[PDB]
């Protein structure tokens, strides 16, 4: 492929690899769901102007949105988390392992 | 479509958007839209198995 | 089965509702003058704010 | 015995007793009727 | 995997025992390594240096299991003579069952797992003599 | 045969289920064993109390049993249908064979000493 | 010898006793995120370096 | 040089996303996805993307200024981490920049380079087409029919974002 | 909640689903998927508590994750078919992607740590609705793609489901801890059949939702969600632990209860294609979901154990829980294996 | 239409038929007290509705024919038995207390079922919300075990936390020394056993405890035992009070519907009053509850749900 997908297709591995090696603030890993789909938008959005693919132009508008709908719902969970414990580290969430 | 609601009741919810082939607004054409209709065309109806 | 990494495990709450923690979600303490537009320049008005 | 409270069941709720029976006589009215016409829908394509 | 598993069985039986043992030892090591990922991810080491005591200890007894089964099947195929035995498996199954209570330490986990290493080992050289699918291909 | 329709109008060349048909008797007898379950479930006397809640679980279960059977018989049909227009279509890879006799066929014999 | 011990111990004691230890490291986890997503990865990346799942 | 345009850029899309997946404090985070957010915004411009390129852009700046409310309030601590301050971090940094400079590196000595996947080398513009002169913007025309041939999409995205101020709701009320 | 809106967000949770099953189109099908994905949370954060904040956030971070993984494949689909259409996909490894992705929202292992612990902190009425209705769409989804599964992929997520999900319930006496093992072992059936025979699939998916809804719905009536709590049934509700008894045995697969119908039809359609060791594997390991199946029943139905004086006081009262649609879902759950060739109604 | 979604969606609200005079009172004091007799005027002056103090067969009253069943259906727990032997071998002294509390738990739904239902108050004598005084008193006399205490708040934590504490506590401030004399002009030979450290402990409790803590969140009338004598000084205190403090204020149709769907569903309000916690005191071997649960079925219109018990006169059970 062209060169270009090269450096898309490697932001959305290291986005992928910061999503699934967590740290210690649930903050940074919503952000790089974000940035997972960032990269998609842009992958996709290529891909559709590259070949004239007319009616995918809107393709890439209905991804952002529901992009926005997930992360209105994780900042939802990071509030109620925050409000829980005071402080959105992942390690206070472990009450089900048993 | 696991359930083809879309077939029994003759409503296009989105299959218009499936192939880039398909019509498009004031008739733009995607830059492969003959080699999208030529395979299309060849393996319509055959099925998979024999149209791979 | 009892285990080493299982003998601090306790069986849940009955209703699922944990207590809440005694975390201090803490004030922030400004210093709102003596040098202040607002305070006439010798007021130290020492105030806790959420937000 | 005679309840202190009246019991939510105590007597039968008419309403609901004609729509169970009228239902039942219902769906079995249609599904004979129905299975009347699959049979002689069936000898007809079948010149019987 | 599949590379490293054509490699021993495209070597006969009894010919070239040396280059078998590579074949198993290459088999074994990878999976005490995949366990020793696993293991590492899911229950942290209390440091750095002992998550490496624990993989090159898990890597190693898989190495060492299949090392004495692919060497021991090896020389019972060539010096009884015959490449195509199941019991020549077996006798290289156990083996590495009791290399296994050996690294671990416990006659008990010796027994158990020469009897299953060695029957489960059998059976794999009966499926490849006669064909067996583990994942058959679907064809009706 | 027709997209996401429950009855293709194929069907209907088929004979209907009867209505006394012994799978359907027994949808039936499981409705009845629901009307039955409700009661107990719910404290009621188990054989006598609500007939009509009892009827309309002996009702209901075989309405929706008919048509479900009926769809089963058509589905078979159309599985023999299939099989037979390929093997049609396609005599070469069935073909009929020639078949001996025993007293022509060699079979081994082994005693049982 | 037999009935009470060796028959027991060769089948049903030690069959039931390996599902045990099975159960116990299979469910003895610390119910935290960041190891489970940390597993995802490792099974990704052998699903495409060792068995090639995605050829 | 200016014939690689869409490649520098993507390599910088790629600086960003090394600079928030390696995780420093959401603060820096943020701005490494501002960062990437504006370059994949001139990607995709340069493909003929004007109205998608800008509006990613915008969607991002205003996602990011909440992101950055929410982290002033929930997610920071006395001495937030640079990449420089932590171990873990700046391990992943490096690491990420060491592994994107050498897929750069070597797909422009080849022209070409093999990085598990067969990635060409010769500049982006040799896939673009070449005859096009009509009195609009393709994207635009696509991008417009949403509301003509996309009803379904309408109807959809319409509702989902009406469930998403119920939801929040919902979810935020202890 | 209010009761207009917690109705609202039960239709849009199943307009989501219905969304991917009537979808001829990758996108509206990922659409679909988040429309579900957002409509649920609400319903395990429903209780406000600390566990169930922690059982939501689990849920939304692999949910969401998973749906990253399902349109990374459908883009790269994209790439080299130029098509959107809902079908096999193109490219081995958007095949790997999707297949993983829907295994992730599917809870099977080795994804499958977040289904034990969400289930557990939530309420019965809402892991009824995650171990059930929330595998129609991910099933649907595999049921049109599978020609271009990888075999040897599919079939290890399936015999790792069916160890783990054996293994895992023999450690539990939390009842929702068990049916989320229950469930991920069953998963593993559903797809071991799927590139031999996908109406199988549907015929498994279909009878373990009937079961799985009888057990949920018999917890219900009696707020039950450990197994202690479980053994005072027989001193209220004696048939209760009857009913309780009888799907068990079922959901163990016993003849000639319905969930032995599955296994069977499943056993069948695999040994067709020469796959014997397969089968035979699964089926003796799934006698260890039978194992801490019947200690349910033993603590339950077959033995009385020990009661509290508490208990006299709840004799003087009816049960009052809907428990809905419970009469039928029993018999079917126990009483359909003479009428299976009715599978046939499935393909 | 019984309550439920439907109701509540078709107008069915809390706030439409609850007004100014919609209280929940509650009347506490030691042991003869004068609550009784203070509690039936203030709910005739009102115009509330009275609930006798919650006892052994509080139960009994609500269900069935409303008469009190054997004591085996209630455990044999006894409260004379109590003042007996309050160290009795065989637990009577928590196994009461434990059985107490769950009749008060019942009593406290059916009040705010009435209350939330109808928009008429309610005057109650003692309530959940005092039980544990009497708890605290028996644990200091060493009556029963730390381990009884820790079931007790064990329960209380899991079923307490469901309500909304009453409106307006009044409490009757009798001095010990004159309830031993008020006890021991009653005449009930057993009650004179009673011991004035006991009672001092409930004194200590209802003082030290349960009034600071109701302060803060319900509107409390201290009365001596002169000042109490005169109803109508006590109703008029009532009808000035401001109601400025307490849960009540944050109450919306939305949240009183969830209350009213758990307090008309007894099986749910009891629920955790038999967690599976194995004390001596209250676990019944499975051969004792099999015998007895027999029994009970065996009364009359127990076999079956209330309306298809034919053996009292219900009728038209084939079509119920
Ligand atoms: C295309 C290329 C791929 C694309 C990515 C390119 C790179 C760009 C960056 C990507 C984002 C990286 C995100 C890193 C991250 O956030 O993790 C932080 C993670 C947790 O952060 P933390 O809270 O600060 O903890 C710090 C200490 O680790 C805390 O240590 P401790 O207190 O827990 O002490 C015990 C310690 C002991 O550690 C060990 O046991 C090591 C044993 C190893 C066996 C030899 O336990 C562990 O560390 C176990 C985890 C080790 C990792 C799993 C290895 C199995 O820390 C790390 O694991 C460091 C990793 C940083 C380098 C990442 C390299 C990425 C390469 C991934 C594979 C590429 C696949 C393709
Ligand atoms: C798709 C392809 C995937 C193939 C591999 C799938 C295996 C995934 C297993 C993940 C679920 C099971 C988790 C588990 O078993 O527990 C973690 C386990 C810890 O066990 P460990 O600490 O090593 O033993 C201690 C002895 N004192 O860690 C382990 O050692 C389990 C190793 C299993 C490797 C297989
Ligand atoms: C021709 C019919 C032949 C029978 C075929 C039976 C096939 C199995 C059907 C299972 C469904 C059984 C019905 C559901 C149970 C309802 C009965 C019950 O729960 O309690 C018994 C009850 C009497 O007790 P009571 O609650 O006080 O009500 C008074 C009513 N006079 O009610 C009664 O008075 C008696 C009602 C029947 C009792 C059923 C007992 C359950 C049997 C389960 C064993 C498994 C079945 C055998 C296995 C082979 C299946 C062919
Ligand atoms: C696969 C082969 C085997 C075939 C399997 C077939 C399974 C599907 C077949 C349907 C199974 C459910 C049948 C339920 C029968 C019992 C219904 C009943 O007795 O209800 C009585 C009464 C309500 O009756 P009502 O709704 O007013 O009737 C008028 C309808 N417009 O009110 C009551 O007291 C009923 C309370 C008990 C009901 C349990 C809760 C369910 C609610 C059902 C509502 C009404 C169902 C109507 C059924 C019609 C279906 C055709
Ligand atoms: C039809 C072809 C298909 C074949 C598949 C098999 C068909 C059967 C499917 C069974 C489905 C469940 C329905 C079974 C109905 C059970 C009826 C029953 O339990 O009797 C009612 C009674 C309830 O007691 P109660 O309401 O309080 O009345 C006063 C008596 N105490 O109950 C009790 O009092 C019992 C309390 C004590 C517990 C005893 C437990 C041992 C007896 C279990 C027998 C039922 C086993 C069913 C399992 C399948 C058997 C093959
Ligand atoms: C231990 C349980 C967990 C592990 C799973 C068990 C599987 C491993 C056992 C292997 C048994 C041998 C086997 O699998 O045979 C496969 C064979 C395939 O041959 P096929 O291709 O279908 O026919 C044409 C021949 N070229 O199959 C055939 O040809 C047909 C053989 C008939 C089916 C036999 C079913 C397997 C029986 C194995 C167990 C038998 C011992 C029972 C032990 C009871 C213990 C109390
Ligand atoms: C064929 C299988 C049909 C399965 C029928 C399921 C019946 C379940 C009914 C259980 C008893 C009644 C009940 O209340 O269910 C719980 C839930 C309502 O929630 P609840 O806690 O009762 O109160 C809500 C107020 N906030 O009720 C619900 O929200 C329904 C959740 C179940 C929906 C999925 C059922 C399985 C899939 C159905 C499609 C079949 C394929
Ligand atoms: C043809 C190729 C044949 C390949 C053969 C592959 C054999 C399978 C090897 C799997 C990996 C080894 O598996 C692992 O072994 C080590 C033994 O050190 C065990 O480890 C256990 O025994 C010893 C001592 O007790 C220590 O390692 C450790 O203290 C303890 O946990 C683990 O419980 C087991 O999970
Ligand atoms: C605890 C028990 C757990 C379950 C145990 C199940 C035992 C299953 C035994 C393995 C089944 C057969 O296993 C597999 O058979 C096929 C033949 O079809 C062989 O297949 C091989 O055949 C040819 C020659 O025959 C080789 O050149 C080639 O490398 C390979 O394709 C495999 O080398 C063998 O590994
Ligand atoms: C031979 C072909 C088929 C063989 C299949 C055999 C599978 C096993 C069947 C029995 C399963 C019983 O599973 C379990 O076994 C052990 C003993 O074995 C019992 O446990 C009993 O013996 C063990 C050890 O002897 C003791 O530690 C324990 O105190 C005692 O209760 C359990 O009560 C039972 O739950
Ligand atoms: C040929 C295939 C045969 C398939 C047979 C089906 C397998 C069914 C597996 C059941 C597994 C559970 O069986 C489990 O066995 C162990 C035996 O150690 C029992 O454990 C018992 O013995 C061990 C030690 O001996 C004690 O630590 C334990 O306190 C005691 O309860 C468990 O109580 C039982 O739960
Ligand atoms: C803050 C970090 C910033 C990181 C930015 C990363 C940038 C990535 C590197 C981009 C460099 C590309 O380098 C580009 O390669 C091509 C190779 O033909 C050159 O193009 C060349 O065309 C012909 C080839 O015959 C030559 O005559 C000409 O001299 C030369 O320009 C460009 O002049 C050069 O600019
Ligand atoms: N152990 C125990 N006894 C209780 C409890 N509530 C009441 N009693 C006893 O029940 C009897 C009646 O209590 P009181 O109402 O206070 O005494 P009284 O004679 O009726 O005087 P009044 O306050 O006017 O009603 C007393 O013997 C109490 O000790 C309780 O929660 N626990
Ligand atoms: N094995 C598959 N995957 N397909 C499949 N069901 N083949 C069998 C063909 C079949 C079976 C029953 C019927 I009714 C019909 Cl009409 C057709
Ligand atoms: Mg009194």
Same mark, same amino acid.
């Given at each position: 492929m062209?060169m270009?997908?090269?450096?898309?297709?490697?932001?959305?591995? %290291?986005?992928? %690899?910061?999503?699934?090696?967590?740290?210690?603030?649930?903050?940074?890993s919503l952000?790089? /769901?974000?940035?997972?789909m960032?990269?998609?938008? %842009?992958?996709?959005? /290529?891909?559709?102007?590259?070949?004239?693919?007319?009616?995918?132009?809107?393709?890439?508008?209905?991804?952002?949105?529901?992009?926005?709908?997930?992360?209105? /719902?994780?900042?939802?969970?990071?509030?109620?988390?925050?409000?829980?414990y005071?402080?959105?580290?992942?390690?206070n /969430?472990?009450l089900?392992?048993? | *479509?696991?359930?083809?609601?879309?077939?029994?009741?003759?409503?296009?919810?989105?299959?218009?958007?499936?192939?880039?082939?398909?019509?498009? *607004?004031?008739?733009? *054409?995607?830059?492969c839209?003959?080699?999208?209709?030529?395979?299309?065309?060849?393996?319509?109806?055959?099925?998979?198995?024999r149209?791979? | 089965?009892?285990?080493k990494?299982?003998? +601090?495990?306790?069986?849940?709450?009955?209703?699922?509702?944990?207590?809440?923690?005694?975390?201090?979600?803490?004030?922030?303490?400004?210093?709102?003058?003596?040098? +202040?537009?607002?305070?006439?320049?010798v007021?130290?008005?020492?105030?806790?704010?959420?937000? | 015995?005679?309840?202190?409270?009246?019991?939510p069941?105590?007597?039968?709720?008419?309403?609901?007793?004609?729509?169970?029976?009228?239902?039942?006589?219902?769906?079995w009215?249609?599904?004979?009727?129905?299975?009347?016409?699959?049979?002689?829908?069936?000898?007809?394509?079948?010149?019987? | 995997?599949?590379?490293?598993?054509?490699?021993?069985?495209?070597?006969?039986?009894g010919?070239?025992?040396?280059?078998?043992?590579?074949?198993?030892?290459?088999?074994?090591?990878?999976?005490?390594?995949?366990?020793?990922?696993?293991?590492?991810?899911?229950?942290?080491?209390?440091?750095?240096?002992?998550?490496?005591?624990?993989?090159?200890?898990?890597?190693?007894?898989?190495? !060492?299991?299949? !090392?004495?089964?692919?060497?021991?099947?090896?020389?019972?195929?060539?010096?009884?003579?015959?490449?195509?035995?199941?019991?020549?498996?077996?006798?290289?199954?156990?083996?590495?069952?009791?290399?296994?209570?050996?690294?671990?330490?416990?006659?008990?986990?010796?027994?158990?797992?020469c009897?299953?290493?060695?029957?489960?080992?059998?059976?794999?050289?009966?499926?490849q003599?006669?064909?067996?699918?583990?994942?058959?291909?679907?064809?009706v | 045969?027709?997209?996401?329709?429950?009855?293709?109008?194929?069907?209907?060349?088929?004979?209907?289920?009867?209505?006394?048909?012994?799978?359907?008797?027994?949808?039936?007898?499981?409705?009845?064993?629901?009307?039955l379950?409700?009661?107990?479930?719910?404290?009621?006397?188990?054989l006598?109390?609500?007939?009509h809640?009892?009827?309309?679980?002996?009702?209901?279960?075989?309405?929706?049993?008919?048509?479900?059977?009926?769809?089963?018989?058509?589905?078979?049909?159309?599985?023999?249908h299939?099989?037979?227009?390929?093997?049609?279509?396609?005599?070469?890879?069935?073909?009929?064979?020639?078949?001996?006799?025993?007293?022509?066929?060699?079979?081994?014999?082994?005693?049982?000493? | 010898?037999?009935?009470?011990?060796?028959?027991?111990?060769?089948?049903?004691?030690?069959?039931?006793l390996?599902?045990?230890?099975?159960?116990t490291?299979v469910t003895?986890?610390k119910?935290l995120?960041?190891?489970?997503?940390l597993?995802?990865?490792?099974?990704?990346?052998?699903?495409?370096?060792?068995?090639?799942?995605?050829? | 040089?200016?014939?690689?345009?869409?490649?520098?850029?993507?390599?910088?899309?790629?600086?960003?996303?090394?600079?928030?997946?390696?995780?420093?404090?959401?603060?820096?985070?943020?701005?490494?996805?501002?960062?990437?957010?504006?370059?994949?915004?001139?990607?995709?411009?340069?493909?003929?993307?004007?109205f998608?390129?800008?509006?990613?852009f915008?969607?991002?700046?205003?996602?990011?200024?909440?992101?950055?409310?929410?982290?002033?309030?929930?997610? #920071?601590?006395?001495?937030?981490e640079?990449?420089?301050?932590?171990?873990?971090?700046?391990?992943?940094?490096? #690491?990420g920049?060491?592994?994107?400079?050498?897929?750069?590196?070597?797909?422009?000595?080849?022209?070409?380079?093999?990085?598990?996947?067969?990635?060409?080398?010769?500049?982006?513009?040799?896939?673009?087409?070449?005859?096009?002169?009509?009195?609009?913007?393709?994207?635009?025309?696509?991008?417009?029919?949403?509301?003509?041939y996309?009803?379904?999409?309408?109807?959809?995205?319409?509702?989902?974002?009406?469930?998403?101020?119920v939801?929040?709701?919902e979810?935020?009320?202890? | 909640?209010?009761?207009?809106?917690?109705?609202?967000?039960?239709?849009?949770?199943?307009?989501?689903?219905?969304?991917?099953?009537?979808?001829?189109?990758?996108?509206?099908?990922?659409?679909?998927?988040?429309?579900?994905?957002?409509?649920?949370i609400?319903?395990?954060?429903?209780?406000?508590?600390?566990?169930?904040?922690?059982?939501?956030?689990?849920?939304?971070?692999?949910?969401?994750?998973a749906?990253?993984?399902?349109?990374?494949?459908?883009?790269?689909?994209?790439?080299?078919?130029?098509?959107?259409?809902?079908?096999?996909?193109?490219?081995?490894?958007?095949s790997?992607?999707?297949?993983?992705?829907?295994?992730?929202?599917?809870?099977?292992?080795?994804?499958?740590?977040?289904?034990?612990?969400?289930?557990?902190?939530?309420?019965?009425?809402?892991?009824?609705?995650?171990?059930?209705?929330?595998?129609?769409?991910?099933?649907?989804?595999?049921?049109?793609?599978?020609?271009?599964?990888?075999?040897?992929?599919?079939?290890?997520?399936?015999?790792?489901?069916?160890?783990?999900?054996?293994?895992?319930?023999?450690?539990?006496?939390?009842?929702r801890?068990?049916?989320?093992?229950?469930?991920?072992?069953?998963?593993?059936?559903?797809?071991?059949?799927?590139?031999?025979?996908?109406?199988?699939?549907?015929?498994?998916?279909?009878?373990?939702?009937?079961?799985?809804?009888?057990?949920?719905?018999?917890?219900?009536?009696?707020?039950?969600?450990?197994?202690?709590?479980?053994?005072?049934?027989?001193?209220?509700?004696?048939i209760?632990?009857?009913?309780?008894?009888?799907?068990?045995?079922?959901?163990?697969?016993?003849?000639?209860?319905?969930?032995?119908?599955?296994?069977?039809?499943?056993?069948?359609?695999?040994?067709?294609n020469?796959?014997?060791?397969?089968?035979?594997?699964?089926?003796?390991?799934?006698?260890?979901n039978?194992?801490?199946?019947?200690?349910?029943?033993?603590?339950?139905?077959?033995?009385?154990?020990?009661?509290?004086?508490?208990?006299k006081?709840?004799?003087?009262?009816?049960?009052?829980?809907?428990?809905?649609?419970?009469?039928?879902?029993?018999?079917?759950?126990?009483?359909?294996?003479?009428?299976?060739?009715?599978?046939?109604?499935?393909? | 239409?019984?309550?439920?979604?439907?109701?509540?969606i078709?107008?069915?609200?809390?706030?439409?038929?609850?007004?100014?005079k919609?209280?929940?009172?509650?009347?506490?004091?030691?042991?003869?007290?004068?609550?009784?007799?203070?509690?039936?005027?203030?709910?005739?002056?009102?115009?509330?509705?009275?609930?006798?103090?919650?006892?052994?067969?509080?139960?009994?009253?609500?269900?069935?024919?409303?008469?009190?069943?054997?004591?085996?259906?209630?455990?044999?727990?006894?409260?004379?038995?109590?003042?007996?032997?309050?160290?009795?071998?065989?637990?009577?002294?928590?196994?009461?207390?434990?059985?107490?509390?769950?009749?008060?738990?019942?009593?406290?739904?059916?009040?705010?079922?009435?209350?939330l239902?109808?928009?008429?108050?309610?005057?109650?004598?003692?309530?959940?919300?005092?039980?544990?005084?009497?708890?605290?008193?028996?644990?200091?006399?060493?009556?029963?075990?730390?381990?009884?205490?820790?079931?007790?708040?064990?329960?209380?934590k899991?079923?307490?936390?469901?309500?909304?504490?009453p409106?307006?506590?009044?409490?009757?401030?009798?001095?010990?020394?004159?309830?031993?004399?008020?006890?021991?002009?009653?005449?009930?030979?057993?009650e004179?056993?009673?011991?004035?450290?006991?009672?001092?402990?409930?004194?200590?409790?209802?003082?030290?405890?349960?009034?600071?803590?109701?302060?803060?969140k319900?509107?409390?009338?201290?009365?001596?035992?002169?000042?109490?004598?005169?109803?109508?000084?006590?109703?008029?205190?009532?009808?000035?009070?401001?109601?400025?403090?307490?849960?009540?204020?944050?109450?919306?149709?939305?949240?009183?519907?969830?209350?009213?769907?758990?307090?008309?569903?007894?099986?749910?309000?009891?629920?955790?009053?038999?967690?599976?916690?194995?004390?001596?005191e209250?676990?019944?071997?499975?051969?004792?509850?099999?015998?007895?649960?027999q029994?009970?079925?065996?009364?009359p219109?127990?076999?079956?749900?209330?309306?298809?018990?034919?053996?009292?006169?219900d009728?038209?059970?084939?079509?119920?």
């Amino acid at each position: 492929m062209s060169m270009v997908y090269m450096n898309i297709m490697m932001a959305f591995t %290291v986005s992928l %690899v910061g999503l699934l090696m967590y740290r210690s603030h649930l903050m940074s890993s919503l952000l790089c /769901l974000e940035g997972m789909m960032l990269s998609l938008f %842009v992958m996709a959005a /290529l891909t559709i102007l590259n070949s004239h693919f007319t009616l995918a132009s809107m393709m890439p508008i209905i991804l952002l949105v529901f992009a926005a709908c997930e992360a209105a /719902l994780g900042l939802s969970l990071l509030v109620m988390v925050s409000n829980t414990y005071g402080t959105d580290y992942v390690q206070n /969430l472990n009450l089900l392992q048993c | *479509p696991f359930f083809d609601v879309q077939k029994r009741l003759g409503v296009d919810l989105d299959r218009w958007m499936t192939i880039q082939s398909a019509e498009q *607004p004031h008739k733009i *054409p995607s830059r492969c839209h003959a080699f999208e209709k030529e395979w299309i065309e060849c393996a319509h109806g055959i099925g998979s198995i024999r149209a791979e | 089965y009892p285990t080493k990494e299982t003998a +601090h495990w306790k069986p849940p709450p009955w209703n699922d509702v944990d207590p809440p923690k005694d975390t201090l979600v803490s004030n922030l303490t400004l210093n709102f003058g003596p040098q +202040h537009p607002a305070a006439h320049g010798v007021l130290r008005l020492v105030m806790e704010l959420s937000g | 015995k005679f309840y202190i409270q009246e019991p939510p069941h105590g007597s039968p709720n008419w309403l609901k007793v004609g729509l169970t029976l009228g239902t039942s006589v219902f769906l079995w009215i249609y599904l004979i009727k129905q299975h009347n016409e699959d049979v002689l829908e069936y000898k007809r394509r079948n010149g019987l | 995997a599949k590379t490293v598993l054509r490699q021993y069985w495209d070597i006969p039986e009894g010919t070239e025992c040396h280059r078998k043992t590579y074949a198993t030892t290459s088999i074994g090591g990878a999976a005490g390594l995949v366990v020793s990922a696993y293991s590492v991810a899911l229950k942290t080491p209390t440091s750095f240096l002992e998550g490496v005591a624990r993989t090159g200890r898990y890597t190693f007894t898989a190495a !060492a299991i299949g !090392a004495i089964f692919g060497l021991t099947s090896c020389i019972s195929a060539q010096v009884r003579e015959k490449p195509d035995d199941p019991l020549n498996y077996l006798i290289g199954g156990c083996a590495g069952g009791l290399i296994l209570g050996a690294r671990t330490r416990s006659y008990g986990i010796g027994a158990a797992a020469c009897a299953y290493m060695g029957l489960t080992a059998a059976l794999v050289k009966m499926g490849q003599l006669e064909g067996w699918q583990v994942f058959a291909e679907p064809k009706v | 045969r027709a997209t996401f329709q429950f009855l293709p109008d194929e069907a209907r060349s088929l004979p209907p289920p009867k209505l006394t048909d012994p799978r359907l008797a027994f949808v039936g007898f499981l409705g009845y064993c629901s009307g039955l379950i409700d009661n107990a479930i719910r404290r009621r006397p188990v054989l006598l109390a609500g007939l009509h809640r009892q009827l309309l679980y002996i009702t209901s279960f075989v309405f929706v049993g008919y048509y479900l059977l009926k769809r089963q018989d058509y589905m078979y049909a159309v599985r023999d249908h299939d099989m037979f227009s390929y093997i049609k279509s396609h005599p070469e890879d069935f073909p009929e064979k020639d078949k001996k006799t025993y007293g022509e066929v060699f079979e081994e014999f082994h005693p049982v000493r | 010898l037999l009935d009470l011990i060796w028959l027991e111990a060769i089948l049903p004691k030690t069959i039931s006793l390996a599902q045990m230890k099975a159960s116990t490291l299979v469910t003895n986890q610390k119910g935290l995120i960041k190891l489970y997503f940390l597993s995802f990865l490792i099974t990704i990346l052998i699903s495409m370096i060792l068995f090639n799942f995605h050829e | 040089m200016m014939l690689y345009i869409v490649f520098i850029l993507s390599v910088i899309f790629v600086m960003g996303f090394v600079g928030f997946s390696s995780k420093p404090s959401p603060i820096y985070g943020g701005l490494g996805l501002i960062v990437s957010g504006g370059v994949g915004c001139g990607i995709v411009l340069n493909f003929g993307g004007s109205f998608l390129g800008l509006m990613v852009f915008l969607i991002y700046l205003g996602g990011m200024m909440v992101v950055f409310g929410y982290t002033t309030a929930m997610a #920071t601590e006395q001495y937030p981490e640079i990449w420089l301050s932590n171990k873990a971090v700046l391990g992943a940094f490096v #690491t990420g920049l060491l592994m994107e400079f050498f897929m750069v590196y070597y797909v422009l000595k080849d022209k070409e380079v093999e990085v598990v996947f067969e990635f060409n080398g010769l500049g982006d513009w040799v896939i673009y087409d070449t005859g096009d002169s009509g009195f609009f913007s393709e994207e635009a025309m696509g991008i417009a029919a949403l509301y003509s041939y996309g009803t379904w999409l309408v109807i959809v995205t319409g509702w989902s974002l009406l469930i998403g101020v119920v939801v929040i709701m919902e979810i935020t009320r202890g | 909640m209010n009761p207009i809106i917690f109705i609202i967000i039960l239709l849009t949770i199943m307009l989501g689903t219905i969304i991917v099953m009537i979808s001829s189109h990758w996108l509206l099908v990922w659409i679909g998927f988040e429309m579900n994905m957002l409509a649920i949370i609400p319903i395990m954060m429903k209780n406000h508590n600390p566990r169930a904040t922690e059982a939501s956030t689990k849920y939304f971070l692999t949910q969401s994750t998973a749906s990253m993984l399902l349109m990374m494949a459908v883009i790269i689909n994209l790439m080299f078919s130029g098509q959107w259409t809902v079908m096999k996909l193109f490219n081995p490894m958007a095949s790997m992607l999707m297949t993983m992705a829907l295994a992730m929202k599917l809870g099977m292992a080795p994804f499958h740590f977040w289904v034990p612990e969400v289930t557990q902190g939530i309420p019965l009425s809402s892991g009824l609705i995650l171990l059930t209705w929330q595998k129609l769409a991910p099933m649907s989804v595999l049921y049109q793609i599978f020609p271009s599964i990888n075999l040897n992929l599919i079939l290890t997520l399936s015999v790792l489901s069916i160890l783990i999900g054996g293994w895992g319930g023999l450690n539990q006496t939390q009842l929702r801890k068990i049916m989320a093992y229950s469930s991920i072992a069953h998963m593993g059936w559903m797809t071991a059949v799927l590139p031999y025979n996908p109406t199988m699939t549907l015929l498994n998916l279909i009878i373990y939702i009937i079961m799985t809804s009888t057990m949920f719905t018999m917890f219900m009536a009696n707020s039950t969600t450990t197994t202690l709590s479980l053994s005072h049934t027989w001193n209220k509700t004696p048939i209760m632990t009857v009913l309780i008894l009888a799907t068990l045995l079922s959901m163990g697969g016993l003849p000639p209860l319905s969930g032995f119908m599955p296994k069977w039809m499943i056993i069948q359609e695999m040994t067709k294609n020469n796959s014997i060791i397969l089968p035979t594997f699964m089926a003796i390991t799934a006698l260890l979901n039978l194992y801490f199946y019947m200690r349910l029943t033993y603590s339950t139905t077959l033995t009385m154990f020990p009661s509290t004086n508490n208990m006299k006081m709840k004799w003087q009262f009816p049960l009052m829980k809907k428990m809905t649609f419970l009469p039928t879902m029993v018999v079917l759950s126990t009483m359909m294996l003479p009428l299976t060739p009715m599978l046939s109604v499935l393909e | 239409l019984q309550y439920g979604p439907l109701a509540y969606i078709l107008g069915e609200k809390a706030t439409k038929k609850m007004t100014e005079k919609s209280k929940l009172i509650t009347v506490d004091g030691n042991i003869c007290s004068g609550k009784s007799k203070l509690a039936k005027e203030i709910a005739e002056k009102l115009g509330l509705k009275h609930f006798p103090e919650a006892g052994i067969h509080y139960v009994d009253s609500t269900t069935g024919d409303g008469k009190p069943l054997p004591v085996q259906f209630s455990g044999n727990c006894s409260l004379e038995k109590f003042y007996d032997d309050p160290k009795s071998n065989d637990g009577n002294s928590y196994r009461l207390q434990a059985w107490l509390y769950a009749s008060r738990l019942l009593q406290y739904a059916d009040a705010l079922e009435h209350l939330l239902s109808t928009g008429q108050g309610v005057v109650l004598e003692r309530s959940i919300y005092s039980d544990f005084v009497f708890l605290e008193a028996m644990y200091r006399q060493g009556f029963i075990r730390k381990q009884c205490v820790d079931h007790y708040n064990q329960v209380k934590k899991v079923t307490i936390c469901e309500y909304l504490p009453p409106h307006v506590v009044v409490y009757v401030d009798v001095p010990v020394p004159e309830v031993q004399s008020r006890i021991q002009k009653k005449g009930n030979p057993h009650e004179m056993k009673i011991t004035s450290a006991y009672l001092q402990d409930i004194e200590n409790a209802y003082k030290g405890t349960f009034l600071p803590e109701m302060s803060e969140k319900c509107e409390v009338l201290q009365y001596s035992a002169w000042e109490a004598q005169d109803a109508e000084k006590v109703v008029e205190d009532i009808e000035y009070l401001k109601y400025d403090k307490g849960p009540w204020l944050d109450q919306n149709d939305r949240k009183l519907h969830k209350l009213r769907m758990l307090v008309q569903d007894k099986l749910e309000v009891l629920n955790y009053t038999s967690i599976p916690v194995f004390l001596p005191e209250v676990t019944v071997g499975a051969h004792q509850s099999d015998q007895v649960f027999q029994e009970f079925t065996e009364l009359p219109g127990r076999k079956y749900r209330a309306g298809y018990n034919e053996d009292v006169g219900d009728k038209w059970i084939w079509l119920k």
